[PDB]
Amino acid sequence: MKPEDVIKEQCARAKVVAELWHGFTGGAPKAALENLVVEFNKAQQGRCVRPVPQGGYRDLSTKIKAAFAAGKVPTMAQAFENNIALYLEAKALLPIESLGVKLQGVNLTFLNAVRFGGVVYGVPFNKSIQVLYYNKDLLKKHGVPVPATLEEFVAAAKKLSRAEGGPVYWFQPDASTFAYFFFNLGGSYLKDGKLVLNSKEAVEALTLLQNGVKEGWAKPITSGYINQNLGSGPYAFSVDTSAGYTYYLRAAKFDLGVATLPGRTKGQPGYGLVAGTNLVVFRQASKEEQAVAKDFLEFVLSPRAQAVFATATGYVPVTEGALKDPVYQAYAAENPDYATIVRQSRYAKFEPALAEWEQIRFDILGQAIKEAILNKADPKAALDRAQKLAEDLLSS
Ligand SMILES: Nc1nc2c(ncn2[C@@H]2O[C@H](COP(=O)(O)O[C@H]3[C@@H](O)[C@H](n4ccc(=O)[nH]c4=O)O[C@@H]3CO)[C@H]3CC(O)(O)C[C@H]32)c(=O)[nH]1
Q1: Quick one: which of 198, 278, 367, 379 is 20 to 30 A from 331 by CA?
Q2: Exposed, middle or buried, 9 (CB in 10 Å: 0-12/13-18/19+)?
Q3: Its family (predicted)?
Q4: From the CB of residue 137, how many other CB atoms can be counted at a distance below 10 Å?
Q5: Relative to the CA of 224, which ligand 1 atom is closest?
């Protein structure tokens, strides 16, 4: 018997049911959200949340878009800062504090990202940071220290690739990976409020990956997640969401390591991209459903839910109080990778929160990167196209 079966029974016996639409397809992410919900529904009396999966995050935003045209929205859903911008244009979201959820203790990084015109419209739930995943066995084999700087990372990738007869830095040719190299070469997406995809730090960032592929140290992964490709040739490293931690752990036939990101200098770990989502509450929800929502968002923000959620998944705890929880502390004492993910969460950067950003990162920026990496398009001309499409989409 599965936790979504318990939930189906729990809700059928309930006077009020709050739907939560999500983008967890399977794995520990889906199981930790379901378990959370089971625990919550137990302490209720004919109150409940029903998690409704919708596919991936892009399937979710599309089905929420349609949910609006159709007249029927859930109580709650997962949303990136930029999906929040979109829903705010149609006035669809309740301010979280008017519900009376106490947000003191919530990481200010996470809280600032969900705050529009001084007003919070999301609760940070499943917040991820990019880490350096690596092959402990392979680095030990060649007396290669864990790279601390961009410089050391390129030199180490070249040294292990040469030794093993194939490219050891594995990456997806996507906006998220490009974000790592863009940010840690001084790059920023807004210039005096104008979204810029073709700045010289963009060109340098795409060039680096393209030169990496050409020189035989970087491996573009074109089918599935990196952790779904492990075991086909030598793997030394990947820059990837802390939310992949259980999938890497399940897949790796080598000793898995997690480290902070290489940065420009040893003075600081490089910035990681923040991903995963915030929970929003829809205005269309009834008073009753909104009360379940408030109660559920306080449970989710409770140190124990946050400790269990984050240790079951590798997502970053969103509250100071999660780190003082004994369950957190017990997992951290037997597993240093948790403190490494938290340490990396301090050097965090965000993508723009423009309504059009979901579309831009996938269909325009993502495609420019794929042109460059897979079809050997000039980085500058690839991104210059992107800049033009982005501008056309926005003008619209
Ligand atoms: N819709 C929409 N999506 C966005 C936006 N900005 C970024 N992203 C996506 O967020 C993923 C990161 O969010 P995160 O919670 O850190 O990680 C995800 C999964 O990545 C990860 N996972 C799942 C299965 C697996 O085998 N391995 C694994 O690592 O587990 C989590 C739950 O699915 C990127 C990756 C992507 O899925 O290709 C698309 C990217 C946006 O604005 N909108």
Answers
A1: 278
A2: exposed
A3: Belongs to the bacterial solute-binding protein 1 family.
A4: 14
A5: 26
Q: Are strands 256-259 and 237-241 parallel, antiparallel or unpaired?
A: unpaired
Q: Is 393 left (phi over 0), alpha (psi -120 to 50) or beta?
A: alpha
Residue closest via CA to ligand 1's atom 35 equals: 176
Q: For atom 3 of ligand 1, which residue has the closest CA?
A: 57
Distance CA 257, CA 146 (A): 9
Degrees, nearest 5: CA angle 311-246-167: 135
229 vs 1: CA distance, rounded Å: 30
3-127+276-349 under CATH 3.40.190.10, yes or no: yes
Looking at domain 129-273+351-395, its CATH class is: alpha beta
Q: Which long-range contacts (CB under 8 A, 24 or more apart) does 319-324 make?
A: 319/105, 319/106, 319/107, 320/105, 320/107, 321/105
Residue appearing with tokens 């892009």: 58
**Nearest atom in ligand 1 to 240's CA:** 29
Give the Cα separation of 142 and 252 in Å (integer).
Answer: 19
- For residue 91 the two structure tokens come to 């006035």
Atom 42 of ligand 1: nearest residue by CA position? 358
